[PDB]
Design an enzyme around this catalytic site. Structure first.
Site, PDB file in Angstrom:
ATOM      1  N   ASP A 145       0.731  -1.257  -0.060  1.00  0.00           N
ATOM      2  CA  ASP A 145      -0.026   0.088   0.110  1.00  0.00           C
ATOM      3  C   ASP A 145       0.651   1.304   0.041  1.00  0.00           C
ATOM      4  OD1 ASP A 145      -3.162  -0.325   1.860  1.00  0.00           O
ATOM      5  OD2 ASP A 145      -2.438  -0.824  -0.123  1.00  0.00           O
ATOM      6  N   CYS A 190      -1.896   0.765 -13.656  1.00  0.00           N
ATOM      7  CA  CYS A 190      -1.723   0.512 -12.164  1.00  0.00           C
ATOM      8  C   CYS A 190      -3.018   1.336 -11.701  1.00  0.00           C
ATOM      9  CB  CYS A 190      -0.751   1.375 -11.890  1.00  0.00           C
ATOM     10  SG  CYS A 190      -0.531   1.775 -10.120  1.00  0.00           S
ATOM     11  N   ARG A 212       3.696   2.510 -10.908  1.00  0.00           N
ATOM     12  CA  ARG A 212       4.384   1.405 -10.888  1.00  0.00           C
ATOM     13  C   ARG A 212       4.470   0.690 -12.382  1.00  0.00           C
ATOM     14  NH1 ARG A 212       0.004  -0.973  -6.672  1.00  0.00           N
ATOM     15  NH2 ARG A 212       0.174   0.472  -5.159  1.00  0.00           N
ATOM     16  N   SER A 213       3.539   1.310 -13.363  1.00  0.00           N
ATOM     17  CA  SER A 213       3.632   0.979 -14.680  1.00  0.00           C
ATOM     18  C   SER A 213       4.876   1.271 -15.322  1.00  0.00           C
ATOM     19  CB  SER A 213       2.590   1.822 -15.347  1.00  0.00           C
ATOM     20  OG  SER A 213       1.490   1.331 -14.847  1.00  0.00           O
ATOM     21  N   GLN A 262       6.740   7.900 -10.129  1.00  0.00           N
ATOM     22  CA  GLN A 262       6.204   9.287  -9.563  1.00  0.00           C
ATOM     23  C   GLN A 262       6.706   9.635  -8.274  1.00  0.00           C
ATOM     24  OE1 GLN A 262       4.145  11.762  -8.887  1.00  0.00           O
ATOM     25  NE2 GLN A 262       3.828  11.938 -10.847  1.00  0.00           N
TER      26      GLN A 262
HETATM   27  O1  LIG Z   1       1.551   3.946  -7.457  1.00  0.00           O
HETATM   28  C1  LIG Z   1       1.823   5.261  -8.201  1.00  0.00           C
HETATM   29  O2  LIG Z   1       3.094   5.787  -8.225  1.00  0.00           O
HETATM   30  C2  LIG Z   1       1.111   6.233  -8.556  1.00  0.00           C
HETATM   31  O3  LIG Z   1       0.915   6.415  -9.882  1.00  0.00           O
HETATM   32  C3  LIG Z   1      -0.125   6.550  -7.505  1.00  0.00           C
HETATM   33  C4  LIG Z   1      -1.150   7.524  -8.488  1.00  0.00           C
HETATM   34  O4  LIG Z   1      -2.094   6.506  -8.859  1.00  0.00           O
HETATM   35  C5  LIG Z   1      -1.337   8.929  -8.417  1.00  0.00           C
HETATM   36  C6  LIG Z   1      -1.393   9.278 -10.004  1.00  0.00           C
HETATM   37  C7  LIG Z   1      -1.567  10.674 -10.056  1.00  0.00           C
HETATM   38  C8  LIG Z   1      -1.769  11.810  -8.939  1.00  0.00           C
HETATM   39  C9  LIG Z   1      -1.680  11.131  -7.568  1.00  0.00           C
HETATM   40  N1  LIG Z   1      -2.028  12.090  -6.343  1.00  0.00           N
HETATM   41  C10 LIG Z   1      -3.380  12.455  -5.995  1.00  0.00           C
HETATM   42  C11 LIG Z   1      -4.101  13.858  -6.281  1.00  0.00           C
HETATM   43  C12 LIG Z   1      -3.664  14.437  -7.590  1.00  0.00           C
HETATM   44  C13 LIG Z   1      -4.239  15.759  -7.877  1.00  0.00           C
HETATM   45  C14 LIG Z   1      -5.270  16.551  -6.876  1.00  0.00           C
HETATM   46  C15 LIG Z   1      -5.456  15.865  -5.251  1.00  0.00           C
HETATM   47  C16 LIG Z   1      -4.755  14.444  -5.306  1.00  0.00           C
HETATM   48  C17 LIG Z   1      -0.711  12.744  -5.638  1.00  0.00           C
HETATM   49  C18 LIG Z   1      -0.071  13.798  -6.486  1.00  0.00           C
HETATM   50  C19 LIG Z   1       1.244  13.313  -7.273  1.00  0.00           C
HETATM   51  C20 LIG Z   1       2.016  14.385  -7.786  1.00  0.00           C
HETATM   52  C21 LIG Z   1       1.614  15.999  -7.828  1.00  0.00           C
HETATM   53  C22 LIG Z   1       0.503  16.315  -7.019  1.00  0.00           C
HETATM   54  C23 LIG Z   1      -0.232  15.301  -6.589  1.00  0.00           C
HETATM   55  C24 LIG Z   1      -1.445   9.617  -7.386  1.00  0.00           C
END
Ligand SMILES: O=C(O)C(=O)CC(=O)c1cccc(N(Cc2ccccc2)Cc2ccccc2)c1
Length: 283
Positions: free
Chosen positions: A180, A214, A220-221, A261
């Protein structure tokens, strides 16, 4: 070997420093189509969009949009389609892409629910007696067999084009043990997973691009693809020690944003390649 560089960075806690430099160096292109109004309900996040130049297009005269990208690695001679985990109403689109792109495998690196939240729809049938029908795209999906191992599950599925009535076998590789929070402590399982995917032929030339996803199909992709390509490259280059992850990563980000990320993800990516390198290309 890059292992040295690894240890160097580690001995300096400069991962966030390295990772940030890449986030800055990364490519940035337009996503006009993704941002259109009509395609609003076809996207999952506001910050995870496919570049227009490399977006996969559905072959429907109606709306050809779907948040997925074609990452083409020329030197490695490998291709991957990274996409977002399917939404309640993009499942038909998802499978249509699978069919049209003539993909052989789908890689899932997330669990339907993580941290008490849904990360994507149940887009494949859980029981063979109960198939699934996507009325909008006219495709039938049937679970042929499941094989639940300790770290991942592999499923055989039958995808039929109700229009033509042709049928295809799709392999679904589901990594079910990613934590998680953070990344795996050991790259071991992740690598066996990668190898099982390769062994199936889903990444191979005589098939369409494997479809990977993902949560956002970037976190993770990206790791999955970055590790594959790098290993493949050390496998064909006269000078293996010339494969630069940082270099391969940016080439990849030219096709989709958000690969890797976090800095831990990067560190982990390095690990995977290094370990995989040993196990594959001898020590
Ligand atoms: O397991 C992984 O590595 C992922 O890839 C995981 C994930 O699904 C994923 C993707 C895009 C965004 C996010 N947030 C969520 C958010 C966004 C916008 C507004 C509110 C909340 C975090 C954030 C990151 C970078 C910059 C700013 C925010 C998570």
């Amino acid at each position: 070997e890059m292992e040295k560089e690894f240890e160097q960075i580690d001995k300096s806690g400069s991962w966030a420093a390295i990772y940030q430099d890449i986030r800055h160096e990364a490519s940035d292109f337009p996503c006009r189509v993704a941002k259109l109004p009509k395609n609003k309900n076809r996207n999952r996040y506001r910050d995870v969009s496919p570049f227009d130049h490399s977006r996969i297009k559905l072959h429907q005269e109606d709306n050809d949009y779907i948040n997925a990208s074609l990452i083409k690695m020329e030197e490695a001679q490998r291709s991957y389609i990274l996409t977002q985990g399917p939404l309640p109403n993009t499942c038909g689109h998802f499978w249509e892409m699978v069919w049209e792109q003539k993909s052989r495998g789908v890689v899932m690196l997330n669990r339907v629910m993580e941290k008490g939240s849904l990360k994507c729809a149940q887009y494949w049938p859980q029981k063979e007696e109960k198939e699934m029908i996507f009325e909008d795209t006219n495709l039938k999906l049937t679970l042929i067999s499941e094989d639940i191992k300790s770290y991942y599950t592999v499923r055989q599925l039958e995808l039929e084009n109700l229009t033509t009535q042709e049928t295809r076998e799709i392999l679904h590789f589901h990594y079910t043990t990613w934590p998680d929070f953070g990344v795996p402590e050991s790259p071991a399982s992740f690598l066996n997973f990668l190898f099982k995917v390769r062994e199936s032929g889903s990444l191979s030339p005589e098939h369409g691009p494997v479809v990977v996803h993902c949560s956002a199909g970037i976190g993770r992709s990206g790791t999955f693809c970055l590790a594959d390509t790098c290993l493949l490259l050390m496998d064909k280059r006269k000078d293996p020690s010339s494969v630069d992850i940082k270099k391969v990563l940016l080439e990849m980000r030219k096709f989709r944003m958000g690969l890797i990320q976090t800095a831990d993800q990067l560190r982990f990516s390095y690990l995977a390649v290094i370990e995989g390198a040993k196990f594959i290309m001898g020590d």
